[PDB]
Every structure is written in structure tokens, then in C-alpha cells.
Amino acid sequence: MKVGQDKVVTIRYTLQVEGEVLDQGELSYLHGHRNLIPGLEEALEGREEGEAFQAHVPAEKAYGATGHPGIIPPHATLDFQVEVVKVREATPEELLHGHAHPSG
Ligand SMILES: C=CC[C@@H]1/C=C(\C)C[C@H](C)C[C@H](OC)[C@H]2O[C@@](O)(C(=O)C(=O)N3CCCC[C@H]3C(=O)O[C@H](/C(C)=C/[C@@H]3CC[C@@H](O)[C@H](OC)C3)[C@H](C)[C@@H](O)CC1=O)[C@H](C)C[C@@H]2OC
Ligand SMILES: [Cl-]
Ligand SMILES: [Zn+2]
Ligand SMILES: [Zn+2]
């Protein structure tokens, strides 16, 4: 099923800024509830389970002028390599809380 509003989505990601890897990992989030930076949620819209893609997110849709000191510099364009690992419906409590819960 496709990534979209009220889906719980699991992604693997690599983050680069100016060709340097800053982070890599995996996470699950509830889509459409401001869990992620808006630029990456936009790029995730309608993606299929199993789909791999790249997203280049301008600072205005990420960490902006401030960045995130210690990780993301000011005015950084974020280059993401993403794999959509899993997509499922959110449970009632996930929807109430506005976040993802583990499955086990
Ligand atoms: C206690 C809470 C910690 C909780 C941490 C986790 C679940 C672990 C999760 C793997 C995050 C990583 O931890 C190793 C690490 O991922 C980064 O390195 C990174 O690659 C990144 O940019 N990602 C992660 C991959 C999805 C896109 C983006 C994101 O949207 O991330 C989201 C994010 C930071 C959004 C902010 C929220 C504040 C807004 O103001 C700001 O708006 C400008 C946008 C993350 C997922 C939050 O939803 C949840 C958290 O924060 C950040 C550079 C710093 C972040 O560590 C903190
Ligand atoms: Cl979440
Ligand atoms: Zn919702
Ligand atoms: Zn909860």
C-alpha cells in the first residue's frame, strides 16, 4: 500500500549534506501528523512499500536558517537516500497520539 495520511511508515534513510554522510538509520513514523520535516514527507507522498528514491530537500522545508547545531549546518540542503520498508494502517491509539507505536 502507498505512503499517505494516517499510514504508519517504516523507512531506511541515509542523510548527506554536500556529499558528506551525516546520518543513517531506520525509523517508523505516522504520516500526515508533522512527525518529519515537511520536505521529506512531501517527497514520501504516494511512495510504494519497497520503493527506493532520492530526495533533495531545501532548507526552507527542513531545518532552515538555524539548522540543527551539532548535526545540520545553517541553510543546508538535505540529500536523502530513502527506502520505504513497510506501510500499514495506524491503530486508533496511534492516531490519537499522533505518532507511531512499535509492532514487536
Ligand atoms: C526525542 C525525540 C527524538 C526523535 C528521534 C528519533 C525518533 C530518531 C530518528 C531516527 C531521528 C535521528 O536520531 C538519530 C536524527 O535524524 C536526523 O539526523 C536526520 O537525519 C533527519 O533530519 N531526519 C531523520 C529521518 C527522517 C527525516 C528527518 C526528520 O524529520 O527527523 C525528525 C525531526 C528531527 C524532526 C524535527 C522535529 C523538531 C522540529 O522543529 C524540526 O523542524 C525543523 C523537525 C525526527 C524523526 C523526529 O520526528 C523524532 C525525534 O526527533 C536529524 C537531523 C536529527 C535526529 O536526531 C534527533
Ligand atoms: Cl512517530
Ligand atoms: Zn490523521
Ligand atoms: Zn502513543
Numbering used by the authors: 1 to 104
Provide text from the study.
Finally, we also analyzed binding of the S2, S3, and mutated variants of the S2 peptide to a chimeric TtSlyD construct, in which the IF domain is replaced by the flap loop from human FKBP12 (henceforth abbreviated TtSlyDΔIF). In addition, we carried out co-crystallization with the FKBP inhibitor FK506. FK506 binds in a similar way to all three copies of TtSlyD in the asymmetric unit of TtSlyDFL:FK506 and in both copies in TtSlyDΔIF:FK506, but exhibits some structural variation in parts of the molecule that are more distal to the binding pocket. Specifically, the pipecolinyl ring, which mimics a proline side chain, is inserted into the center of the hydrophobic pocket, and four hydrogen bonds are formed: two to the backbone of N35 and I37 (V55 and I56 in FKBP12), and one each to the side chains of D23 and Y63 (D37 and Y82 in FKBP12). Most noteworthy are three potential interactions between the C9 carbonyl oxygen of FK506 and CH groups of Y13, L15, and F128, which are reminiscent of three putative CH–O interactions observed between FK506 and FKBP12 residues Y26, F36, and F99. As discussed further below, this variability is intimately connected with interactions between the side chain of Y63 and the peptides bound to the FKBP domain. The FKBP12 flap loop inserted into TtSlyDΔIF in place of the IF domain adopts essentially the same conformation as in full-length FKBP12 in the case of TtSlyDΔIF:FK506, while it is partially disordered in TtSlyDΔIF:S2-W23A and TtSlyDΔIF:S3. In addition, we also found that FK506 forms two hydrogen bonds that mimic the β-strand type hydrogen bonds formed by the peptides.
Peptidyl-prolyl isomerases (PPIases) catalyze cis/trans isomerization of peptidyl-prolyl bonds, which is often rate-limiting for protein folding. SlyD is a two-domain enzyme containing both a PPIase FK506-binding protein (FKBP) domain and an insert-in-flap (IF) chaperone domain. In order to improve our understanding of the mechanism of SlyD and of FKBPs in general, we set out to analyze the kinetics, energetics, and structural basis for substrate binding and inhibition of SlyD from Thermus thermophilus (TtSlyD) using 15-residue-long unmodified peptides, which we reasoned would be better mimics of natural unfolded protein substrates than the traditionally used 4-nitroanilide tetrapeptides. In total, we obtained five structures of TtSlyDFL and three of TtSlyDΔIF at a maximum resolution of up to 1.4 Å.
